[PDB]
Symmetry: C3
Subunit: 177 residues, 3 copies
Amino acid sequence: KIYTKNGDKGQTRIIGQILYKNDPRVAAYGEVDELNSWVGYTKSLINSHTQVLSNELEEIQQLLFDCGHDLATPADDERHSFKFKQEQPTVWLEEKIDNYTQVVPAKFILPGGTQLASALHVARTITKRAERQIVQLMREEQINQDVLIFINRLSDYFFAAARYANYLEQQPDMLYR
Amino acid sequence: KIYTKNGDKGQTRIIGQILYKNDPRVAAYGEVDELNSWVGYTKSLINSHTQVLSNELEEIQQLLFDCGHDLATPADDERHSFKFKQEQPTVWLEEKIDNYTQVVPAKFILPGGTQLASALHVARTITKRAERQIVQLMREEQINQDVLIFINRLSDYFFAAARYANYLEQQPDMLYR
Amino acid sequence: KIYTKNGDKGQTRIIGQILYKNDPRVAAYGEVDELNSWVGYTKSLINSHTQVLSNELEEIQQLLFDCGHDLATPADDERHSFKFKQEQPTVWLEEKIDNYTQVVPAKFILPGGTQLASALHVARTITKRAERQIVQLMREEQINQDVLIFINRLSDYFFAAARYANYLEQQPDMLYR
Ligand SMILES: Nc1ncnc2c1ncn2[C@@H]1O[C@H](COP(=O)(O)OP(=O)(O)OP(=O)(O)O)[C@@H](O)[C@H]1O
Ligand SMILES: Nc1ncnc2c1ncn2[C@@H]1O[C@H](COP(=O)(O)OP(=O)(O)OP(=O)(O)O)[C@@H](O)[C@H]1O
Ligand SMILES: Nc1ncnc2c1ncn2[C@@H]1O[C@H](COP(=O)(O)OP(=O)(O)OP(=O)(O)O)[C@@H](O)[C@H]1O
Ligand SMILES: [Mg+2]
Ligand SMILES: [Mg+2]
Ligand SMILES: [Mg+2]
Ligand SMILES: [Mg+2]
Ligand SMILES: [Mg+2]
Ligand SMILES: [Mg+2]
């Protein structure tokens, strides 16, 4: 049974230590879970016009699992150790950003356009929400700061990705009048 | 007029007592509202392949209204009384979990796949978000603990439901590499 | 480069002043961003049956940019000044509410129905979430109270809009049994 009932009183285990479910840690690992499921949702909207975006989103979902793992791990835990390193993943998001920025037409942009592009804009803001929550934790506990670097860059990726999605289906970006 | 303007100063009534809208109670009843509307959204994605899931999601929406009612009710309120009982509803979610678990192929799963399945994964994480917020309240006030038992089981249902949705449209679950 | 890396340590600038990203202000401007991207998502679901709703949603996105601007502006800032006025925008939402209320069939309604209507119900609850967060800020800092009046009315609009969306595609509202 996937349901243990150990949580019915509002408490839960992390990597290693029973916390309340409103604990800033659980919230951080939790928002990254919501973001990941949203990314999965965004990916399912992919069609024949926007099919190139499929792999990288699948990749980001794997990266996000690692992020949630480390976030669920206390920094002083003797038995359990940070597994996420920001360098390769973040550099990789930076190339896609530069690539998508040069492709698209160079006022402030409002989030919307194609269904996929709008969903990419949604992921941009859910990324930020998870990030605020990761900073709330960082402020009370030691975290893998690598997670924070990557997440920060990730919302930028999403913006870049959104504009590109609009581009792939001949759709102008929504601009603030 | 559905707009009274009584709220324009950031205050609102609950069952019974004027609270601030950022009050942990309002937040709890509020996240359950967001979850319910998300469930409604998920249900609207149902097609001919996934049509069996329609009734139970509609049912969950009724269950969630009862949950939000009790959450909006102070435990010491003389005039107003808890209406949600977890036993029948939660047992019913447990049978669907066991049924969906035995049907599907038995690594950690990443949220995604069909549009409906991904949307079910989204509801799984929104359920948890509302749950964290229900624990935040539980920690300062007396709540219907029955609500918390059900909500906890509900995110488990959603996981089970998501895998099944992927199954109904011949789609393998996304797995952590 | 759209990525400055100035934020990788969890801090960010507002209008004018470096804050933490979990700062109640950033959260307020942030939830309004998420709501706006959600509105954009809702708009992308528009088809031939529901095409009249397109302009007003685009309009709301512009209104929401102004709201986030003012929310990101300290009230005592000498160089920077509130740009959102609730009167015209809010009156305009009130006419659409009265118009949509008279059109639709006059029990409590559960959020769901057509895909667009359900997505409008989602925006109704995301509006409220951003509103709770705007009250959390209002409680510690001076805000443009005009923003709060409009946002409050905006969730009411969304309810009205949702019922209308269901109406435009011959779909009965989901009712609490
Ligand atoms: N409401 C929540 N929000 C975010 N993360 C959670 C929440 N509840 C649990 N988790 C985390 O995700 C993991 C898997 O979730 P699970 O539902 O199994 O937790 P639980 O409530 O403790 O267990 P159970 O549902 O069996 O009682 C948990 O170990 C915990 O770290
Ligand atoms: N921002 C919010 N988030 C979550 N729940 C809310 C919020 N505002 C109100 N509610 C709850 O939902 C009920 C219905 O919402 P409603 O918008 O009518 O509240 P209000 O703001 O007090 O009224 P009005 O919009 O007429 O000024 C309220 O009685 C309150 O309990
Ligand atoms: N996590 C967040 N949630 C909500 N709002 C944010 C967040 N991070 C930044 N903002 C706001 O939106 C603006 C644009 O976002 P941006 O990502 O450029 O911020 P940053 O993290 O400071 O910069 P960078 O990503 O270049 O390091 C910022 O100036 C800030 O006011
Ligand atoms: Mg479980
Ligand atoms: Mg940033
Ligand atoms: Mg109202
Ligand atoms: Mg649980
Ligand atoms: Mg940036
Ligand atoms: Mg209101």
